[PDB]
Structures are given as structure tokens and as C-alpha cells.
Write an enzyme that holds these catalytic residues in place. Structure first.
Site, PDB file in Angstrom:
ATOM      1  N   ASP A   1      57.963  39.070  43.574  1.00 40.60           N
ATOM      2  CA  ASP A   1      57.343  38.011  43.193  1.00 40.60           C
ATOM      3  C   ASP A   1      57.458  37.581  41.429  1.00 40.60           C
ATOM      4  OD1 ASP A   1      53.921  39.550  41.217  1.00 40.60           O
ATOM      5  OD2 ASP A   1      54.315  37.754  41.751  1.00 40.60           O
TER       6      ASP A   1
ATOM      7  N   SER B   1      53.796  42.503  46.959  1.00 39.26           N
ATOM      8  CA  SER B   1      54.423  42.712  45.447  1.00 39.26           C
ATOM      9  C   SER B   1      54.263  44.677  46.162  1.00 39.26           C
ATOM     10  CB  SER B   1      53.450  42.943  44.538  1.00 39.26           C
ATOM     11  OG  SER B   1      54.071  41.723  43.855  1.00 39.26           O
TER      12      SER B   1
ATOM     13  N   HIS C   1      54.536  36.415  39.229  1.00 43.49           N
ATOM     14  CA  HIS C   1      54.473  36.351  38.102  1.00 43.49           C
ATOM     15  C   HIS C   1      54.942  37.379  36.865  1.00 43.49           C
ATOM     16  CE1 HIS C   1      52.068  35.728  41.598  1.00 43.49           C
ATOM     17  NE2 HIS C   1      51.170  35.056  40.592  1.00 43.49           N
TER      18      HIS C   1
HETATM   19  C1  B12 Z   1      48.520  31.962  35.563  1.00 41.50           C
HETATM   20  C2  B12 Z   1      48.328  32.602  37.362  1.00 41.50           C
HETATM   21  C3  B12 Z   1      49.430  31.962  38.754  1.00 41.50           C
HETATM   22  C4  B12 Z   1      50.451  30.861  37.879  1.00 41.50           C
HETATM   23  C5  B12 Z   1      51.726  32.022  37.922  1.00 41.50           C
HETATM   24  C6  B12 Z   1      52.998  32.182  36.288  1.00 41.50           C
HETATM   25  C7  B12 Z   1      52.924  33.517  35.365  1.00 41.50           C
HETATM   26  N1  B12 Z   1      53.632  33.707  34.716  1.00 41.50           N
HETATM   27  O1  B12 Z   1      51.898  34.187  35.516  1.00 41.50           O
HETATM   28  C8  B12 Z   1      50.336  30.016  39.058  1.00 41.50           C
HETATM   29  C9  B12 Z   1      49.963  29.160  38.364  1.00 41.50           C
HETATM   30  C10 B12 Z   1      52.486  29.169  39.010  1.00 41.50           C
HETATM   31  C11 B12 Z   1      49.744  30.711  40.317  1.00 41.50           C
HETATM   32  C12 B12 Z   1      50.989  30.708  41.950  1.00 41.50           C
HETATM   33  C13 B12 Z   1      50.375  30.789  42.413  1.00 41.50           C
HETATM   34  N2  B12 Z   1      49.259  32.202  42.687  1.00 41.50           N
HETATM   35 CO1  B12 Z   1      48.782  32.969  40.475  1.00 41.50          CO
HETATM   36  N3  B12 Z   1      47.368  33.764  39.663  1.00 41.50           N
HETATM   37  C14 B12 Z   1      47.655  32.581  37.837  1.00 41.50           C
HETATM   38  C15 B12 Z   1      45.792  33.548  37.570  1.00 41.50           C
HETATM   39  C16 B12 Z   1      45.518  32.882  36.801  1.00 41.50           C
HETATM   40  C17 B12 Z   1      46.110  35.040  36.553  1.00 41.50           C
HETATM   41  C18 B12 Z   1      46.930  36.098  36.193  1.00 41.50           C
HETATM   42  C19 B12 Z   1      47.606  36.094  34.303  1.00 41.50           C
HETATM   43  O2  B12 Z   1      49.034  35.820  34.526  1.00 41.50           O
HETATM   44  N4  B12 Z   1      46.712  36.225  33.801  1.00 41.50           N
HETATM   45  C20 B12 Z   1      46.817  36.770  32.343  1.00 41.50           C
HETATM   46  C21 B12 Z   1      47.743  38.366  32.346  1.00 41.50           C
HETATM   47  C22 B12 Z   1      48.042  38.539  31.127  1.00 41.50           C
HETATM   48  O3  B12 Z   1      47.150  39.329  33.136  1.00 41.50           O
HETATM   49  P1  B12 Z   1      47.940  40.446  33.979  1.00 41.50           P
HETATM   50  O4  B12 Z   1      48.813  39.715  34.725  1.00 41.50           O
HETATM   51  O5  B12 Z   1      46.675  40.640  35.094  1.00 41.50           O
HETATM   52  O6  B12 Z   1      47.808  41.966  33.146  1.00 41.50           O
HETATM   53  C23 B12 Z   1      47.421  42.624  32.850  1.00 41.50           C
HETATM   54  C24 B12 Z   1      47.302  44.006  32.944  1.00 41.50           C
HETATM   55  O7  B12 Z   1      46.806  43.483  35.111  1.00 41.50           O
HETATM   56  C25 B12 Z   1      48.749  43.870  33.279  1.00 41.50           C
HETATM   57  N5  B12 Z   1      49.888  44.906  33.827  1.00 41.50           N
HETATM   58  C26 B12 Z   1      50.352  43.688  34.533  1.00 41.50           C
HETATM   59  N6  B12 Z   1      51.867  44.178  33.738  1.00 41.50           N
HETATM   60  C27 B12 Z   1      51.814  45.454  34.048  1.00 41.50           C
HETATM   61  C28 B12 Z   1      52.732  46.122  34.042  1.00 41.50           C
HETATM   62  C29 B12 Z   1      53.217  48.202  33.669  1.00 41.50           C
HETATM   63  C30 B12 Z   1      54.043  48.062  33.312  1.00 41.50           C
HETATM   64  C31 B12 Z   1      51.383  47.862  33.704  1.00 41.50           C
HETATM   65  C32 B12 Z   1      51.537  49.925  33.072  1.00 41.50           C
HETATM   66  C33 B12 Z   1      50.612  47.519  33.778  1.00 41.50           C
HETATM   67  C34 B12 Z   1      50.449  45.590  33.541  1.00 41.50           C
HETATM   68  O8  B12 Z   1      48.956  43.764  31.359  1.00 41.50           O
HETATM   69  C35 B12 Z   1      47.968  42.552  31.220  1.00 41.50           C
HETATM   70  C36 B12 Z   1      47.496  42.473  30.290  1.00 41.50           C
HETATM   71  O9  B12 Z   1      48.060  42.118  29.218  1.00 41.50           O
HETATM   72  C37 B12 Z   1      45.214  34.563  38.983  1.00 41.50           C
HETATM   73  C38 B12 Z   1      44.070  35.051  38.418  1.00 41.50           C
HETATM   74  C39 B12 Z   1      43.436  36.420  38.610  1.00 41.50           C
HETATM   75  N7  B12 Z   1      43.273  37.206  38.534  1.00 41.50           N
HETATM   76  O10 B12 Z   1      44.439  37.393  38.335  1.00 41.50           O
HETATM   77  C40 B12 Z   1      46.263  33.775  39.641  1.00 41.50           C
HETATM   78  C41 B12 Z   1      46.765  34.894  41.275  1.00 41.50           C
HETATM   79  C42 B12 Z   1      47.213  36.039  40.844  1.00 41.50           C
HETATM   80  N8  B12 Z   1      47.507  33.932  41.893  1.00 41.50           N
HETATM   81  C43 B12 Z   1      47.099  34.254  43.671  1.00 41.50           C
HETATM   82  C44 B12 Z   1      47.866  33.364  44.586  1.00 41.50           C
HETATM   83  C45 B12 Z   1      46.934  33.235  45.803  1.00 41.50           C
HETATM   84  C46 B12 Z   1      48.637  32.270  44.300  1.00 41.50           C
HETATM   85  C47 B12 Z   1      50.218  32.005  44.900  1.00 41.50           C
HETATM   86  C48 B12 Z   1      51.010  31.909  45.993  1.00 41.50           C
HETATM   87  C49 B12 Z   1      49.078  30.479  45.206  1.00 41.50           C
HETATM   88  C50 B12 Z   1      49.877  29.162  45.966  1.00 41.50           C
HETATM   89  N9  B12 Z   1      50.558  28.180  45.269  1.00 41.50           N
HETATM   90  O11 B12 Z   1      50.746  29.149  47.167  1.00 41.50           O
HETATM   91  C51 B12 Z   1      51.407  30.850  43.671  1.00 41.50           C
HETATM   92  C52 B12 Z   1      52.843  32.614  43.852  1.00 41.50           C
HETATM   93  C53 B12 Z   1      53.967  31.263  43.775  1.00 41.50           C
HETATM   94  C54 B12 Z   1      54.516  31.047  42.538  1.00 41.50           C
HETATM   95  N10 B12 Z   1      55.671  31.789  42.480  1.00 41.50           N
HETATM   96  O12 B12 Z   1      54.317  30.356  42.289  1.00 41.50           O
HETATM   97  C55 B12 Z   1      46.318  35.438  43.573  1.00 41.50           C
HETATM   98  C56 B12 Z   1      46.846  36.901  44.580  1.00 41.50           C
HETATM   99  C57 B12 Z   1      46.122  37.476  45.264  1.00 41.50           C
HETATM  100  C58 B12 Z   1      47.026  37.517  47.186  1.00 41.50           C
HETATM  101  N11 B12 Z   1      46.944  38.179  47.878  1.00 41.50           N
HETATM  102  O13 B12 Z   1      48.485  37.440  46.634  1.00 41.50           O
HETATM  103  C59 B12 Z   1      45.946  36.250  42.564  1.00 41.50           C
HETATM  104  C60 B12 Z   1      44.694  36.885  41.944  1.00 41.50           C
HETATM  105  C61 B12 Z   1      44.516  34.860  42.724  1.00 41.50           C
HETATM  106  C62 B12 Z   1      42.870  34.984  43.685  1.00 41.50           C
HETATM  107  N12 B12 Z   1      41.557  35.108  43.510  1.00 41.50           N
HETATM  108  O14 B12 Z   1      43.443  35.079  44.968  1.00 41.50           O
HETATM  109  N13 B12 Z   1      49.334  31.932  39.529  1.00 41.50           N
END
Ligand code: B12
Length: 577
Positions: free
Chosen positions: A107, A160, A109
Site C-alpha cells: 500500500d 492491504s 497511503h
Molecule cells: C487522498 C487519497 C488518495 C491519494 C493517496 C496518497 C496519501 N498519502 O493519502 C491518491 C490521489 C494519490 C489516491 C490514489 C489511489 N486510490 Co485513493 N483515496 C484518497 C481518499 C480521497 C482519502 C484518504 C485520505 O488520505 N484520508 C485522510 C486521512 C487522514 O484519513 P484515513 O486514511 O482514513 O485515516 C484516519 C483513520 O482511518 C485512521 N487510521 C489510518 N491509519 C491508521 C494507523 C493505525 C496504526 C490506527 C490504529 C488507525 C489509523 O487515522 C486517521 C485520522 O487521522 C480516499 C476516500 C476515502 N474514502 O477515504 C481514497 C481511497 C483510499 N482510494 C481508493 C483507490 C481505489 C485508489 C487507487 C487504486 C486509484 C487509481 N488511481 O487507480 C490509487 C492507489 C495507488 C497509488 N499508488 O496512487 C479507495 C480504496 C477502495 C479499494 N477497494 O481498493 C478509496 C477508499 C476510495 C473509494 N471509495 O473507493 N488516493
């Protein structure tokens, strides 16, 4: 002359850690270091006597992550100064616990992980981060080599969830006892409670956000709750399992046979697919300036944990002020990058002739419709449908048996290859602010190129909307004809298909971007998907696919029925292993 520069260096240090100031940090850190016997009292003193302030104020809504990150910077530049006087006067000094956190092998992210990472470095917890696409082996090794008290993994893609269950097994097969926290938005309290906790006889807990983390980790190490907690959780994860076990299922699945028959009904005889104004694979680039006008700042703020939907979020009587300065710094950065070209979003687009066949999209080398250059494979919803058809992205393409010369396109863009270098740059100077800032922007410019590109595609390249004119607003609302699904989304869950898109475009050959092992992309901030024109194409969810299709698909891909079951684990309509 400065009312705040006239206080005890131990109260100005709390100020530097709160108002985020590293200008007088080295002195406000050295003064307290000299007014201190053993070098580390400051670390456990005014630093934490301030971090606990940063936290308390944080929890009172008197601060926000955007600021806490600027605070953590002063705390790291303060420690980046007291590193030497502790290297020659090693005393270790107490913390609140150590933990190895990393992004599940494959992964990319990581920001969501880097946020929870510092949120704990604000509670005095030591966080030995590992990064992304890190092998479950390196992760456990680190846990040992550093004698961590916990291990937190983060993954947001489909592969993942599977690579996570691997670590749980390894911890259970190597004698670990330290808890195992699963992280990610995609990861749910369900998959964790049903497909992971049962592979490690140790504490395996899930957390929704960087806020809950502090709470969980705490009662997970406390010698007065650690038991009440674990038991409480296990008994809960028990409910989840039996709960989804009863709802397994509520809506019975269907056969790949009856499914394909109940496909998207549409008279292709009357209709006549819009030809592509162009065909082939062309490399494409766009200045940051061009892309800036396509950026969707909503998720941007959403990242720094700021509730809001740009631009109205700039007003909001709550964070409106922060959302602004953040938005300020963001743009101020894009400015230096756009001028210095230190970052250049790159990409590639392509359009080829194609036709549907069952559940696949045949792609020909040219209008002759003779020799195929590749075949885009797609799944098909397999649940009982009522009034609707078991949708498959293949349907929206002219069936080869209709003569209607249809077309399909693909793309792969990045906010620039310089992401990594730039991130490490700030990483060195110990600055998590710009590090997370540039990563966030790269993501923005990346998705921005996806819209900008798709636009020019709907207008020029494909040409079924040359006079189309829309504002960033309408674009976000998707006020247009056609969809641009991408491997991973519920429309096309199978990730290995990225292969096809990289093949058909020779992406690495025109952009430099690359595909790792788990079919992740590079740089991190990169997007790639397809293009469909049919005015009825819509984003749906393949949902639960039964056995008969996993096999048939593994048959069309030539993949081992099992291996396939892996890549589509979250989508499988049964309980495979
Ligand atoms: C920005 C983002 C990206 C970026 C990634 C860079 C990065 N560093 O984040 C970009 C634009 C490049 C991208 C691309 C892709 N993505 Co993307 N992306 C997003 C998006 C809009 C938001 C996630 C994000 O970063 N959120 C903000 C953070 C702060 O929130 P979070 O990760 O959820 O974390 C919170 C908690 O979950 C938690 N948590 C997370 N880490 C940890 C660790 C521990 C130890 C613990 C206990 C808790 C915990 O703490 C956070 C609160 O601060 C989502 C939509 C969504 N539904 O989330 C999709 C999403 C993650 N992406 C998705 C997909 C489909 C893709 C791509 C394969 C698409 C493509 N281009 O073909 C690619 C990945 C390959 C690659 N190498 O680029 C999917 C996954 C579905 C699946 N079945 O695989 C999502 C859910 C969209 C959807 N609804 O379908 N993505």
C-alpha cells in the site's frame, strides 16, 4: 521589547510549542538545557509541560491538527538540538510507550498514518515509523530490534486487508504478545473482528481515527484497564462476527449465468457510439498553474482533520481562520513549485477501438477490429436484482456482435515524480508540516490532472462534448456524460487490471511512474483509470462475486483460482481461505 520574550525560558518554550515558533527554539531549548542538570529534563519538562498543553488545548477545540503539526515541528527541532547532549550523556529518559507503525506491504497511503503518528508524539509516545509498502517481515523485526510495546499497521487498498492478516499470523507464529492495531478508513471494525483478530491470540484492536488511537493505546498499556479493555473488545468483536454472520446473507446472491442474461439492457441498433476524435497513446503534461484551477480542496482540509467543504469552510465560525492560513500556506507552496518547476505533474492518455464480449472489453490495434492488443477484464454484480440489471462496465461498450464501432480510453497521471525527494527534503530538516503539505498537494495536483485531463478528453481527444463548458463546481458534481472508473473502486475492484492500463499506455515509458508488487503506483500521489462515453455509464459496486465467477475470471486472467480469491477478498460472496 517582546512581551513574551520577557518570561522564563521554560514558559516561552511552552509558547514556542503552542504558537509554533522555532526561531528562538534552539536557545529556549538550550537555556532550559543549561538550567538543567542531566540533558533530558527539558524533554520531560517544559517540552511535555507544553505538549500536554498543546493536547489539552487541542481537546478543548482551542487548537487543531494543522497547528499541532507546527507544534510538533518545534518539539522535533528542539529534540533535534538536544540529540547530541544526550548521545554523549545517554540517559534514555522515560516516555509513554514505544510503537512500530508502518503502511501494510504494497500500500502507499501513509498520510492518514503519519497523522496518527504525530498525534501520539504529542502524548509523549515514541513512534518508530517505517513508511509504506513495508514487508510484514521488516515490521516485526523492527518491533524486536526496538523492543516496541505495540505495532500499528495502516492500509487503505484491497490487498492491504490480506497483507495485514499475514502480520497477525506472524506475530502469532513468532511468539509476539504486544498488541496489533489495524488502521485505515477502508479497514472496518468488521473485517478486523472477523478476518484478523482470530489469527493472533494477542490484542488485535481497530481504531477509527487518530483521536481514538490515543484513547485505545492508553487503556491498552495501563496496568488498571488493559484487562477490562481487551475483554471488552473481544466480547464486542464477538458481537460483530455473529451480527454479520446472521446478516450472512440478507440479500441472496445469483449465478454468473442469470447475471449475464440480466445485463444492462440497451438497443445498440438505434444508438450509435460516438467516434473518437483521436486514437492512440499520447503523453500529456500540464503546469501547476493550469491544474491549480481544478484542485478539489475539500479533501485537502479533510486531510488535516478540518471539518468543512471548500470554500464555505473558509468562513465557518469554527476553523475558518485555520482553514485559511492552511489554504494560504498550501497556495504559497504551489506558488514556489509552479515558479521553480521543482515539481511537474506528468501523465499519459490513450484511446483505442473496443467492443464488449460477455464481461470483457476487447481492445483492437486499430479500426480494422481484427487483431486485439489487449483485453480489459471486468466483473459483474452478482446479487439478486429487482428492476435493475447486474451492471458491468463491459455493458456500456458496444457488443462486438453489433458492428457499432465503440471506443474506450485510459490514463495515468501523477502530481509529479519529485514527490518523494521533496518529502524527504523537509524530512531531513525535521519539518512534518511541509512534508505532509507537499504530499497532500501532490495528491491534489494529481487528482486535479485527472479532471483537467478527462475534460480535454470529453471535449477534444474523444470529442463528444467540444462545446462543453463547466466550472470546477459542476465538475465535482460530475455534470457531464460518461465515467472514468479506476482499478480499485467498487466499479472495478480487481487491482491487477492496473496492469492492462500500464500496458496499453506504456506508462513507465511515457511518464516514469511504476507499479510495485501489490500493484501500487509511483509516486504515491498518482491516479489512473479508464474512460467510458456511453451516456448511461454510472459508478456502481460489483459487491459480492460468487465462486463460479472467481473461477471463470481466474480462467480469463489465467490466474490461480485462489490467487484471484485474494485480490478480490473483500468482494468474495463466500468465506474462502
Ligand atoms: C487522498 C487519497 C488518495 C491519494 C493517496 C496518497 C496519501 N498519502 O493519502 C491518491 C490521489 C494519490 C489516491 C490514489 C489511489 N486510490 Co485513493 N483515496 C484518497 C481518499 C480521497 C482519502 C484518504 C485520505 O488520505 N484520508 C485522510 C486521512 C487522514 O484519513 P484515513 O486514511 O482514513 O485515516 C484516519 C483513520 O482511518 C485512521 N487510521 C489510518 N491509519 C491508521 C494507523 C493505525 C496504526 C490506527 C490504529 C488507525 C489509523 O487515522 C486517521 C485520522 O487521522 C480516499 C476516500 C476515502 N474514502 O477515504 C481514497 C481511497 C483510499 N482510494 C481508493 C483507490 C481505489 C485508489 C487507487 C487504486 C486509484 C487509481 N488511481 O487507480 C490509487 C492507489 C495507488 C497509488 N499508488 O496512487 C479507495 C480504496 C477502495 C479499494 N477497494 O481498493 C478509496 C477508499 C476510495 C473509494 N471509495 O473507493 N488516493
Amino acid at each position: 521589547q517582546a512581551e513574551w520574550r520577557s518570561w522564563e525560558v521554560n514558559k516561552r518554550l511552552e509558547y514556542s510549542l503552542v504558537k509554533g515558533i522555532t526561531e528562538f527554539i534552539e536557545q529556549d531549548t538550550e537555556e532550559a538545557r543549561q538550567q538543567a542538570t542531566r540533558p533530558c529534563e527539558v524533554i520531560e519538562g517544559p517540552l511535555m509541560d507544553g505538549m500536554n498543553v498543546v493536547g489539552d488545548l487541542f481537546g478543548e477545540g482551542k487548537m487543531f491538527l494543522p497547528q499541532v503539526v507546527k507544534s510538533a515541528r518545534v518539539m522535533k527541532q528542539a529534540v533535534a538540538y538536544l540529540e547530541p547532549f544526550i548521545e554523549a550523556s545517554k540517559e534514555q529518559c522515560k516516555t509513554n510507550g514505544k510503537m512500530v507503525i508502518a503502511t501494510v506491504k504494497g500500500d502507499v497511503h501513509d498520510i492518514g498514518k503519519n497523522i496518527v503518528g504525530v498525534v501520539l508524539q504529542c502524548n509523549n509516545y515514541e513512534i518508530v515509523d517505517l513508511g509504506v509498502m513495508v514487508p510484514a517481515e521488516k515490521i516485526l523485526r523492527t518491533a524486536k530490534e526496538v523492543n516496541a510495546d505495540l505495532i500499528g499497521l495502516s492500509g487503505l487498498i484491497t490487498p492491504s486487508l490480506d497483507e495485514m492478516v499475514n502480520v497477525a499470523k506472524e506475530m502469532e507464529r513468532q511468539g509476539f504478545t504486544i498488541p496489533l492495531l489495524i488502521g485505515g478508513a477502508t479497514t472496518s471494525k468488521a473485517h478486523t473482528a472477523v478476518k484478523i483478530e482470530q489469527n493472533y491470540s494477542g490484542p488485535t484492536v481497530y481504531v477509527q481515527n487518530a483521536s481514538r488511537t490515543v484513547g485505545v493505546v492508553a487503556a491498552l498499556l495501563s496496568d488498571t484497564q488493559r484487562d477490562d479493555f481487551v475483554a471488552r473488545t473481544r466480547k464486542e468483536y464477538e458481537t460483530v462476527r455473529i451480527q454479520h454472520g446472521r446478516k450472512k446473507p440478507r440479500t441472496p446472491p445469483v449465478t454468473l449465468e442469470a447475471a449475464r442474461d440480466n445485463d444492462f439492457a440497451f438497443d445498440w441498433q438505434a444508438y450509435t457510439p460516438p467516434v473518437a476524435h483521436r486514437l492512440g497513446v499520447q503523453e500529456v503534461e500540464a503546469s501547476i498553474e493550469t491544474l491549480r484551477n481544478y484542485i478539489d480542496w475539500t479533501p485537502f482540509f479533510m486531510t488535516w482533520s478540518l471539518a468543512g467543504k471548500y470554500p464555505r469552510i473558509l468562513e465557518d465560525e469554527v476553523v475558518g481562520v485555520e482553514a485559511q492560513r492552511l489554504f494560504k500556506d498550501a497556495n504559497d507552496m504551489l506558488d514556489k513549485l509552479s515558479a521553480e518547476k521543482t515539481l511537474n505533474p506528468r501523465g499519459v492518455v490513450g484511446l483505442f477501438p473496443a467492443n464488449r464480449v460477455g464481461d470483457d472489453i476487447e481492445i483492437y490495434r486499430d479500426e480494422t477490429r481484427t487483431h486485439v492488443i489487449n483485453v480489459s477484464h471486468h466483473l459483474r454484480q452478482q446479487t439478486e436484482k429487482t428492476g435493475f440489471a447486474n451492471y458491468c462496465l463491459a455493458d456500456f461498450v458496444a457488443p462486438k456482435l453489433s458492428g457499432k464501432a465503440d471506443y474506450i480510453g485510459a490514463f495515468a497521471v501523477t502530481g509529479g515524480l519529485e514527490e518523494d525527494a521533496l518529502a524527504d527534503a523537509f524530512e531531513a530538516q525535521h519539518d512534518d508540516y511541509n512534508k505532509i503539505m507537499v504530499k497532500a498537494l501532490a495528491d491534489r495536483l494529481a487528482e486535479a490532472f485527472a479532471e483537467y485531463l478527462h475534460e480535454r478528453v470529453r471535449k477534444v481527444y474523444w470529442g463528444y462534448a467540444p462545446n462543453e463548458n463547466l466550472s470546477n463546481e459542476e465538475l465535482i458534481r460530475e455534470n457531464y456524460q460518461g465515467i472514468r472508473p479506476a482499478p480499485g473502486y467498487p466499479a472495478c475492484p480487481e487491482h491487477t487490471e492496473k496492469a492492462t492500463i500500464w500496458e496499453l499506455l506504456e506508462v513507465e515509458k511515457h511518464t516514469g511512474m511504476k507499479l510495485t508488487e501489490s500493484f501500487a503506483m509511483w509516486p504515491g500521489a498518482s491516479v489512473s483509470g479508464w474512460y467510458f462515453s456511453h451516456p448511461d455509464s454510472k459508478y456502481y459496486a460489483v459487491a459480492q462475486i460468487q465462486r463460479d465467477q472467481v473461477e471463470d475470471y481466474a480462467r480469463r486472467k489465467g490466474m490461480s483460482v485462489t490467487e484471484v480469491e485474494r485480490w478480490l477478498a473483500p468482494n468474495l460472496g463466500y468465506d474462502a481461505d
